């Protein structure tokens, strides 16, 4: 029954495929070597950093480490504006609210803690404690001050509602753990990558999957969304990055090298979307020409594996947090 539908989908994808992006990208000159330099080193985490996020203002950034600390850095001055102590030391994700008032963090507690920063008391406290996931919570992303999408290790995602404090919709269909997700620029749909080597696109409003992409061979540790929202990129344990498009329904590009045999940990795009910066278990991050799949630089400089990466919304800098816990900012 399902094999017929799978065959139909594959045949439709092949019919829609005429020429690969590599084939038609020969007419564009390459970006060339990029000598990105460390402009800041935001040391201060006691243990390995596992996630970080930029504020919409592109100045503040929240970073979570396994020592139970969630530090909000002012990237320009390197000062720490808050150091939230978590109730559970094993935090695996963090998120900065688009308005900059709240900060979410998940982890092995299976619970998403939402802290309020702009609080009249002057001290940050757990504004909300969203529970309902039956597994470790592996990604958080705010849609506004009253919504947050959390993807957990129980093979599900969930759109919550902070004001009322319980699930508003549940996104199911993944076979394995849902490692990471990325919201579209319009926050009308989002793609989540799981360990079943498949990334699924969900409509936040409809609460149902729209299309799945299964071009990977192993777990999908990282996933982003091309700046225009019409395509996304994923990184898997097989050391390969894959750029899929929503409309083409299929993989557009594969970024890989013969000298990398270690999985991805974090991917992101530049403001224009021309560059794809991917963090690797090889203690370094690589910049890829999103249109030509060429290693246009390498951001080495971490004594341990890069666990999180993120470009500022204005595109000025690229923060990179690694298990060495120094969180270098590149530009």
């Amino acid at each position: 029954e399902a094999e017929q539908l799978k065959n139909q989908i594959r045949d439709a994808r092949k019919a829609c495929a005429d020429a690969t992006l590599s084939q038609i990208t020969n007419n564009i000159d390459p970006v060339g070597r990029i000598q990105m330099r460390t402009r800041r080193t935001l040391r201060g985490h006691l243990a390995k950093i596992y996630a970080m996020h930029w504020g919409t203002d592109s100045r503040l950034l929240v970073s979570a480490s396994q020592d139970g600390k969630l530090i909000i850095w002012d990237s320009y001055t390197t000062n720490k504006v808050h150091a939230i102590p978590l109730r559970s030391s094993w935090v695996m994700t963090c998120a900065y609210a688009p308005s900059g008032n709240y900060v979410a963090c998940g982890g092995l507690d299976n619970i998403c803690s939402i802290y309020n920063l702009k609080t009249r008391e002057g001290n940050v406290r757990v504004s909300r404690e969203l529970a309902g996931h039956t597994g470790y919570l592996s990604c958080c992303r705010f849609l506004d001050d009253n919504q947050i999408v959390t993807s957990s290790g129980d093979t599900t995602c969930a759109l919550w509602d902070i004001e009322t404090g319980q699930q508003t919709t549940t996104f199911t269909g993944h076979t394995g753990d849902v490692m990471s997700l990325s919201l579209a620029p319009d926050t009308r749909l989002f793609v989540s990558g799981a360990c079943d080597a498949s990334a699924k696109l969900w409509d936040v409003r409809e609460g149902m999957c729209r299309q799945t992409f299964t071009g990977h061979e192993s777990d999908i540790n990282a996933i982003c969304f091309f700046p225009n929202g019409n395509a996304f990129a994923t990184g898997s344990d097989d050391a390969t990055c894959r750029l899929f498009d929503l409309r083409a329904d299929q993989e557009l590009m594969t970024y890989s090298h013969d000298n990398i045999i270690c999985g991805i940990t974090s991917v992101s795009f530049s403001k224009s979307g021309r560059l794809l910066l991917a963090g690797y278990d090889d203690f370094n991050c690589n910049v890829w020409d999103a249109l030509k799949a060429d290693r246009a630089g390498v951001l080495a400089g971490h004594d341990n594996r890069v666990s999180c990466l993120g470009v500022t919304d204005d595109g000025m800098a690229v923060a990179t947090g690694s298990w060495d816990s120094f969180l270098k900012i590149w530009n």
């Binding site: 390995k48 596992y50 396994q66 001055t77 000062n79 299976n110 619970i111 039956t134 597994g135 290790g153």
Partner: protein, 237 residues
């Protein structure tokens, strides 16, 4: 000459206060020893966790127990799904993995030797010692003593097995039991010895349903586990 300078001074004051707090917390973090409590549900992991609880709400059940002026932080991860290859990466910095395995139920044992094999050879745990608790020995002793303990069928090699010379059995236990309980211990040790370049070790311990010495055993092993770490750091290796 005051609009931007008061804010800068306030930001620096907050930064220095936060840095002082982080320095204060660093001593506690370095002093506390983090542990991971793995083992099947049929094993007595929860009972041991409570037994040191006397001396987490959802997902991961932390446990503060303190012995000899040093505090141990155990993390029973029983709230997660059956599969663990992903969140195991979180505990790459744990001092020692505590592995509680039910020595009584044999049918559910050859899987505990295989959860141990994957753990021992795991990519992110090839530098973490495993404190192995062969729990529920009283049940095993009364089960073998009462017969119907056809452990030979599950492991045919048990027929061609004899108690090792270096064993230290209690004076008043059935010699058959001593050969049965040391047989299981060796199987886990064979898995541990078959891999690892002397970078992490296995500490097999026999525990009953109730034993106040479990915290002491973990303290002794953690003492020896960091002793090896200190020797490596001091270039004695």
């Amino acid at each position: 000459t005051e609009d931007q300078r008061n804010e800068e001074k306030a930001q620096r004051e907050a930064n220095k206060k936060i840095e002082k707090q982080l320095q204060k917390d660093k001593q506690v973090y370095r002093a506390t020893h983090r542990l991971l409590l793995l083992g099947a549900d049929n094993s007595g992991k929860s009972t041991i966790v409570k037994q040191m609880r006397i001396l987490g709400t959802s997902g991961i059940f932390e446990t503060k127990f303190q012995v000899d002026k040093v505090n141990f932080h155990m993390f029973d991860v029983g709230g997660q799904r059956d599969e663990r290859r992903k969140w195991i990466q979180c505990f790459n910095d744990v001092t020692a993995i505590i592995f509680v395995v039910d020595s009584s139920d044999y049918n559910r044992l050859q899987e505990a030797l295989n959860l141990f094999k994957s753990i021992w050879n795991n990519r992110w745990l090839r530098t973490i010692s495993v404190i192995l608790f062969l729990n529920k020995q009283d049940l095993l002793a009364e089960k073998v003593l009462a017969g119907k303990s056809k452990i030979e069928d599950y492991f045919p090699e048990f027929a061609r097995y004899t108690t090792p010379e270096d064993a230290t059995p209690e004076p008043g236990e059935d010699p058959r039991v001593t050969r049965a309980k040391y047989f299981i211990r060796d199987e886990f040790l064979r898995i541990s010895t078959a891999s690892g370049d002397g970078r992490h070790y296995c500490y097999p311990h026999f525990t009953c349903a109730v034993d106040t010495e479990n915290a002491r055993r973990i303290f002794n092993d953690c003492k020896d586990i960091i002793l090896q770490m200190n020797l490596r750091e001091y270039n004695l290796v």
